[PDB]
Design a protein around this ligand. Structure first.
Ligand code: GDP
Ligand code: MG
Lengths: 207, 170
């Protein structure tokens, strides 16, 4: 069983309680702030290279190193549910213009194909994973909602306080993380795919 | 002579498979992606006994200090992409830029390698665009398959020849 916050203020109190203990360095904070402004670019290059960073320019590779190492200081004290919303391309380029019916519902053919592609399988994410403690407005209107079951002790950082650019109740997960997709179902709407996944962890564990 | 080769290229392009095909004449599938290893074997290169050293880089955790170190020590580079992955071809410019930044020598022994030539049916990168880039970079382009062995020995031996030529002065 995983904590799932039902109230923003409670989520904030929990997050703050974790954040207070991090003791991030100035450079770690700067790297994280930068991330909250530049996630698309950093995560894009990570995905482009399937996690390989030795072609990254000085600034980016230093930021990656700082980010990676910051997770030594940022752990969840508790089994926690984390949320993110995704657009169709998350399922693969073949879903990009294909997932949605003209009326805004998820196409059931596309859905079954996505289920075939992903259900009961591990998925490796090369980028860092920006999530939220709750299904926030930022994510809640997207066609794919992922609920991550994140185990006690896992690397996970509450970064909402660190940056004005941070998502609402943002929890950052380390890059190169594997999660296992346990369940995929349509919302009662028919307008969203709800994915339930168990976070397994990151390959990125600097001493 | 010891010719120090570094494998570079995005995850999944076939650096490990190519290395193991060259080293042990075997096609090794799904070699641990984040695992790096160094290899060394004696070969006869144009009549002369030499040793090749290959660093099969993982690269996912090779921070500035690490990659700069092995770029500096490396004498020649196999810059591998997969012909079935345009993103991996795009990334070759990045590896080369970072190599050039540390070595400060545009004449660094370097081969552009388009791997997975057995997957013509899934090709995303045109031979044209790859050859054009190779020409632009004043390097050779070779299409390989670690699966079929296609041009695998060639890329290593050609690179060694380049390292040997570079060593000829001094
Ligand atoms: N069909 C085919 N597959 C290959 C070839 N080279 C590597 N692979 C496969 O592509 C995937 C990535 O290969 P790998 O050697 O691990 O690439 P690396 O991450 O750059 O070291 C693995 O599943 C390999 O078995 C090739 O020439 N042809
Ligand atoms: Mg490898």
């Amino acid at each position: 069983t995983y904590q799932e916050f039902t109230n923003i203020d409670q989520a904030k109190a929990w997050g703050n309680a974790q954040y207070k203990k991090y003791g991030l360095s100035k450079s770690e904070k700067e790297a994280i702030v930068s991330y909250t402004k530049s996630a698309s670019e950093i995560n894009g290059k990570l995905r482009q290279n399937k996690g390989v960073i030795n072609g990254f320019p000085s600034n980016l590779i230093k930021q990656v190193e700082l980010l990676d190492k910051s997770f030594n200081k940022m752990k969840t004290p508790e089994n926690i549910m984390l949320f993110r919303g995704d657009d169709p391309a998350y399922l693969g380029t073949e879903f990009q213009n294909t997932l949605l019916n003209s009326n805004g519902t998820i196409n059931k053919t596309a859905f079954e194909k996505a289920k075939a592609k992903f259900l009961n399988k591990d998925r490796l994410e090369y980028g860092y994973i920006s999530t939220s403690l709750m299904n926030v407005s930022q994510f809640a209107g997207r066609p794919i909602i992922t609920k991550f079951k994140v185990a006690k002790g896992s690397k996970a950082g509450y970064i909402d306080p660190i940056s004005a650019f941070a998502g609402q109740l943002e929890m950052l997960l380390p890059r190169h993380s594997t999660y296992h997709i346990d369940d995929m179902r349509l919302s009662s709407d028919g307008k969203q795919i709800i994915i339930t996944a168990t976070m397994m962890g990151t390959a990125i564990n600097p001493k | 002579a010891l010719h120090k080769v570094i494998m570079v290229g995005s995850g999944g392009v076939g650096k490990s498979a190519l290395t193991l095909q060259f080293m042990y004449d075997e096609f090794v599938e799904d070699y641990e992606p984040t695992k790096a290893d160094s290899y060394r074997k004696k070969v006869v290169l144009d009549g002369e006994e030499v040793q090749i050293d290959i660093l099969d880089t993982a690269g996912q955790e090779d921070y500035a200090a690490i990659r700069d170190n092995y770029f500096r020590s490396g004498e020649g580079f196999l810059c591998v992409f997969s012909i079935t992955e345009m993103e991996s071809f795009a990334a070759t410019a990045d590896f080369r830029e970072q190599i050039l930044r540390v070595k400060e020598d545009e004449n660094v022994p370097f081969l552009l390698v388009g791997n997975k030539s057995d997957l013509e049916d899934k090709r995303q990168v045109s031979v044209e665009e790859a050859k054009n880039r190779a020409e632009q970079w004043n390097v050779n382009y070779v299409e390989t398959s670690a699966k079929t062995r296609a041009n695998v020995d060639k890329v290593f031996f050609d690179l060694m020849r380049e390292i040997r030529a570079r060593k000829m002065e001094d």
